[PDB]
């Protein structure tokens, strides 16, 4: 009821990957109940980025996920006050990232304050050499670990040369308001796509479709 069927999205990301500093702005719309969102991104500082845009893209809100009536929707119940998440990304060649987002809502707009820090990417690796093509579609497993709603996902970045480059996501999610009830364990299928880009990925349009389910 706080959440409307059509919502706007405003975003700023600040960050640092292998010592390279950057600022990216986002402006988007989505449909919370249909699990669908898209966003226009614009690098404001630090471009052209010297690393694969793709590592960033899952950091640019689990409110945009279609929940059936039989799974508690922790994210939609967190509003208007909102919620935050923190995520670790562990890549198979030793690259590591920590991201966080603090999400708030004013009227019909979600505001997102995002931080992204990456380190230990090898200079000869697919991320620093810009050899990535896309994330494969994924299934996040949602469960409770020590009172905290936790999502794990085994992700795969398709590289040039038909190889995959693997990484493990762990995200913890916390409602701002005390006493929003935790859900039971469940799944969310995701698909994320770059729809269009310019030469150095200074402008990117992004799309995500997500659906919650009980595994059947």
Residue numbers in the entry: 2 to 61, 65 to 220
Give me lines lifted from the publication on this model.
The mGeos series of rsFP’s display similar switching behavior to Dronpa. We present high resolution room temperature SFX structures of Skylan-NS in both ‘on’ and meta-stable ‘off’ state collected using two different XFELs, the SPring-8 Angstrom Compact free electron Laser (SACLA), Japan and the Linear Coherent Light Source (LCLS), USA.
The hit-rate could be carefully controlled with the crystal density, and levels of 40% could be sustained with crystal densities of 4.8 × 107–9 × 107 crystal/mL. Table 1 shows the CC* and R-split values that reveal data from the droplet method was lower quality than that obtained from the grease injection method. The R-factor for the on- and off-state experiments using the droplet methods (green) (but at different photon energy) is considerably higher than the two off-state measurements conducted at different facilities, including the lower resolution reflections. Following complete refinement of all four datasets, both on-state structures showed no statistically significant density in either the 2Fobs-Fcalc or the Fobs-Fcalc maps that could be assigned to a trans chromophore structure. This is in agreement with the dark incubation and dark sample injection which corresponds to a 100% on-state concentration. Photoisomerisation is clearly seen in a comparison of the “on” and “off” refined structures where the dihedral angle of the chain connecting the phenol ring to the rest of the chromophore (N–C=C–C) changes from 1° (cis) → 171.1° (trans) in the on- vs the off-state and the pheonolic oxygen is displaced by 6.2 Å.
